[PDB]
C-alpha cells in the first residue's frame, strides 16, 4: 500500500487510487532501478521469503503489474508479467507466491489460454500445478473459465454465450477478452452456416449468432459472401461464401499424379 519512501510502496499506492496510465509510465523506471542489482528473481539463495532481495519484492510488483496491464488494455505486457508470476507460485520455487489476488490473476490466466484458442494449453496448465481440482471448484472467480472451457468441449453455442454474458467478471476485466473470444465463435458459426444451409431466414442467422443489431447482421451477412434479399439470407449452396470458398483457392488432380509417378521410378530402381 502507501509509501514508506520506496518504489514498490509508491507503485502499490498509485494503483489503488486509479491512475493506471501513471502506473504504466512508472513501471519502466522502477524495473530499471531494480534491474542493475541482483533482483528480478526470488534468487538461488532463497530459503525463506521473509528476508529481502528475494521473492517478496518481486511478487508485490508483479501482482500489481498484471492487474494494471488489463486496465490499460495491453495483452502483450500482460504476457510478460504472467510469465514471471506463474513460475513463482510453483514450478521451481515455493508453493505460494500469491495471496487473495491469486484468484483473480489465475482466473485471467485460464481465460488468456482459452482466448488464444487452445483447449490443450488450458489443460496443460492445470496438470502442471497438481492442485487442479480443489482450486478450480473452490474459487468463484476460477469456476467461470472452467465453465467456459467445458462449454467449449461439449458444444453448446447457446450455453457458451450465456455463461459469458451472465457473469460478474465479464463486466470487470473479462471484458478485455470478450472480443477475442467472440471472434473465435463467430468464425465457427459462419463456416457451419454456409455448409449446413441451403436456405435460411435473416432472423434465424441473427438469433444464432446472437446479434444485438439487425443492421450489424446485414453487414455480417454480406461480409461472409452471403447475398441477401430482405428478411432472408440465401447461399451459393454448400461449398462457398465463408466456408473455405467465396475466396476461390483449391480444387486439383495434379498432386496425386506426381506421387504416383515418383513411386514407379523408386520401385524400378530397387528391382533391377
Amino acid at each position: 500500500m502507501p509509501s514508506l519512501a520506496e518504489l514498490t510502496k509508491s507503485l502499490s499506492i498509485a494503483f489503488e487510487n486509479g491512475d493506471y496510465a501513471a502506473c504504466e509510465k512508472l513501471l519502466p523506471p522502477i524495473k530499471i532501478e531494480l534491474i542493475k542489482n541482483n533482483l528480478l528473481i526470488p534468487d538461488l539463495s532463497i530459503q525463506n521469503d521473509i528476508y529481502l532481495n528475494d521473492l517478496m519484492i518481486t511478487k508485490r510488483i508483479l501482482e500489481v503489474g498484471a492487474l494494471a496491464s488489463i486496465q490499460t488494455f495491453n495483452f502483450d505486457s500482460f504476457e510478460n508479467y504472467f510469465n514471471q508470476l506463474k513460475p513463482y507460485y510453483f514450478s521451481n520455487n515455493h508453493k505460494l507466491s500469491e495471496s487473495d489476488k491469486k484468484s483473480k490473476l489465475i482466473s485471467l490466466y485460464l481465460l488468456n489460454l482459452l482466448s488464444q484458442n487452445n483447449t490443450t494449453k488450458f489443460h496443460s496448465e492445470l496438470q502442471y500445478l497438481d492442485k487442479h481440482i480443489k482450486n478450480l471448484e473452490d474459487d468463484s472467480l476460477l469456476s467461470y473459465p472452467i465453465k467456459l472451457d467445458r462449454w467449449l468441449m461439449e458444444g453448446s453455442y447457446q450455453k457458451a454465450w450465456d455463461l459469458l454474458q451472465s457473469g460478474s467478471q465479464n463486466i470487470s476485466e473479462f471484458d478485455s477478452f470478450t472480443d477475442i473470444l467472440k471472434s473465435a465463435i463467430r468464425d465457427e458459426i459462419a463456416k457451419n452456416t454456409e455448409l449446413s444451409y441451403d436456405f435460411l431466414p435473416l432472423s434465424n442467422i441473427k438469433a444464432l449468432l446472437f446479434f444485438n443489431n439487425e443492421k450489424e447482421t446485414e453487414k455480417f451477412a454480406l461480409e461472409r459472401n452471403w447475398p441477401i434479399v430482405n428478411s432472408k439470407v440465401y447461399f451459393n449452396n454448400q461449398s462457398k461464401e465463408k466456408a473455405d470458398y467465396e475466396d476461390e483457392m483449391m480444387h486439383e488432380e495434379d498432386q496425386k499424379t506426381n506421387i504416383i509417378e515418383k513411386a514407379m521410378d523408386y520401385a524400378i530402381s530397387i528391382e533391377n
Binding site: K31, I32, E79, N80
Partner: peptide, 13 residues
C-alpha cells in the same frame, strides 16, 4: 520464461 519476460520490456538494463 521469467528471464525472457524481462527481455521484452525493452530497455538497456
Amino acid at each position: 520464461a521469467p528471464l525472457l519476460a524481462l527481455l521484452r520490456e525493452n530497455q538497456d538494463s
